[PDB]
Design a protein around this nucleic acid. Structure first.
Lengths: 63, 62
DNA sequence: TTTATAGCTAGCTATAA
DNA sequence: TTTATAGCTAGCTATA
């Protein structure tokens, strides 16, 4: 999943940082990079009960 | 998931290490500690197509 | 609220038995 | 094969 999809999912940056257990500064860094680091994407996919999918899972499932 | 479940799943430490994209020495650390680090547990769950469950998922389904 | 970035350390890899 | 641990940096937190 892309940082903007994470922000849509929880509603804003503050709620996204609380939703995945980081500081807002981590979410702004993902947004600026246009990318969530890979173990983090797995952890977000797990912690959201797969409502958000990692790039790994989307690729594996054939997009 | 516990480090013993991870190793039983792949067959041995070498195969576990290849299976989750780490060196065997990372797997020996998890076994000796008795725990796999949290983000790592999530990655193993995703990379095994949910065949192994993180402690988080195990607890949530309980 | 967001940007920019210094500064730290968990959790790896590398190594030497 | 496994132990013990040094060497190291990605990816955070803390800040300004």
């Amino acid at each position: 999943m892309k940082p903007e999809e994470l922000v849509r999912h929880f509603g804003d940056v503050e709620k996204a940082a609380v939703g995945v257990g980081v500081t807002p500064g981590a979410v702004y860094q993902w947004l600026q990079a246009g990318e969530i680091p890979p173990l983090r994407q797995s952890d977000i996919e797990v912690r959201t009960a797969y409502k958000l999918k990692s790039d790994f899972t989307s690729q594996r499932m054939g997009k």
